[PDB]
Structures are given as C-alpha cells and as structure tokens.
C-alpha cells in the first residue's frame with residue numbers, strides 16, 4: 592500500500608497511480624519572483640463562523656479533522672474560485688525535524704509543516720463527484736514555522752494521544768478552524784492535484800503567504816503519532832510530505848501587488 596517509506600513512498604506512487612507523472616501535479620515550488628500579481632482575482636472569502644467539526648481520525652497517513660458538509664456552513668469563496676466550496680476536512684503534513692515537512696516550498700524553502708483545509712465545489716453535489724471535475728476542489732494551504740505557540744492549535748495537539756495509531760478516531764466537536772489562520776489572506780494560486788494517491792488533478796490551490804507560528808512542543812506531538820495500527824511495529828508518523836513536482840505549463844498568480 593502507498594505510504595512515505597523508502598519502499599512505498601512518493602517515488603513509487605506512479606506504478607499504481609500513473610497520473611503521478613501528469614501535467615498538473617502538486618505540490619510545486621512557488622518562485623515568488625516569477626509569480627505575477629493578478630488584478631482579476633476577486634476578494635477571497637473564508638467564512639468559517641458556522642463550521643461544525645465532528646471527529647478526528649488517524650488514517651495511517653496523517654490525521655484528519657472532519658466537518659459536517661451536508662449544508663453550506665464553513666465555506667470558501669472568491670479569489671480564483673467560481674462558486675461556493677464547502678469545507679470537508681483539514682489535515683497537516685510535517686517533518687521529522689523542523690527544517691522539512693511542508694509540501695509546497697517558497698523559493699525552495701521548506702517549512703516545518705503545512706496545513707491543508709480541503710473544500711469541494713457545491714455545484715457537483717458531493718465530494719466524490721467533485722473529484723471527477725477539473726474544478727472540483729479548493730485546498731487552502733498554510734505554512735507552519737516553529738516559534739511561538741498557536742493557541743488555536745492546542746486542542747488538536749492535546750487529542751493526539753487518543754488517536755495514536757491507524758484507524759483510531761475521537762469525537763472532535765466544537766472546534767473552530769478560524770484559530771488556525773494567519774492574520775493576512777495574501778496568497779498564491781495555481782491549478783494542481785491531490786498530493787496523496789489518487790493524485791487526482793481536481794484542485795485549485797490557494798497557498799497563503801503568511802505562515803502561522805506553532806511551538807516546538809506542538810509539532811513534536813504531531814511526531815509522536817504512528818503510521819501503523821495498534822499492536823503493529825511502531826513507525827513514527829513523520830515526513831508525510833510529497834516533494835515539489837514539475838510546474839510544466841502552469842503559472843502561479845499572486846493576490847497581492
């Protein structure tokens with residue numbers, strides 16, 4: 592099964608998911624000097640005040656915080672997006688050390704981790720139909736650097752001991768994802784893909800320029816999770832990131848002059 596190890600990691604994925612070598616794969620390096628300000632991008636609207644979180648799950652690759660997406664609540668609109676995209680889950684990618692962990696890079700810089708808030712285009716009715724469409728998904732990506740603690744992350748940190756191994760879940764109601772955002776919504780955007788199998792080319796990426804700061808202790812607790820299930824040999828859940836992929840025939844646009 593796919594994973595991040597030497598024998599099943601990103602360099603192997605193409606054998607079962609040939610789109611891994613496709614024309615709009617993610618992540619990419621964001622060259623900040625070649626990214627061009629796009630005056631046509633509409634204002635971005637992150638509207639999370641009515642979000643309904645439900646559960647946190649260790650899926651053997653990362654942990655997902657899942658949201659009720661049965662009606663318009665937490666939604667992402669504007670920017671490059673045509674229509675309304677509903678929040679379904681967020682998760683992170685992170686490293687074994689603070690010097691790596693992000694999927695996107697900024698002028699080749701790797702951050703300690705990267706948060707992905709995943710949304711699907713409501714015109715397609717359900718996530719499964721959305722991932723059959725070129726404009727089915729929008730992922731809001733946020734870099735994490737290590738410094739001061741992020742208060743809005745601590746509830747996540749503090750529940751991880753209850754979902755240590757693959758297949759474990761816990762109730763995670765009444766969590767406010769607004770506490771994970773930076774101050775500024777300046778962003779870069781480009782068309783890409785899921786960064787894990789099945790690597791589907793359905794995503795409008797919106798990557799915020801301003802990182803959030805998290806404490807060393809917060810990210811260290813991410814690294815205590817396990818890729819394996821209960822009773823199996825312990826494999827620490829670290830380095831669950833895909834490296835940057837070829838930009839090919841794409842341009843990265845900036846929301847800011």
Ligand SMILES: OC[C@H]1O[C@@H](O)[C@H](O)[C@@H](O)[C@@H]1O
Nearest residue numbers: 640641642643764765766767
């Ligand atoms: O409890 C987390 C969040 O859930 C939302 O549904 C509420 O409207 C917010 O006020 C609250 O902060």
Ligand SMILES: OC[C@H]1O[C@@H](O)[C@H](O)[C@@H](O)[C@@H]1O
Nearest residue numbers: 627628629630841842843844
């Ligand atoms: O032909 C000129 C156009 O080239 C495109 O590649 C750029 O995205 C546009 O910003 C530019 O106006």
Ligand SMILES: OC[C@H]1O[C@H](O)[C@H](O)[C@@H](O)[C@@H]1O
Nearest residue numbers: 746750762763764765766767
């Ligand atoms: O908001 C997410 C979670 O935070 C804390 O773990 C609370 O104890 C729990 O009740 C809540 O579900």
Ligand SMILES: NS(=O)(=O)c1cccc(F)c1
Nearest residue numbers: 707709730784785786787
């Ligand atoms: N890492 S990611 O591209 O955000 C992603 C991968 C797979 C499924 C999904 F909903 C989101």
Ligand SMILES: [Zn+2]
Nearest residue numbers: 682684707786
């Ligand atoms: Zn992701």
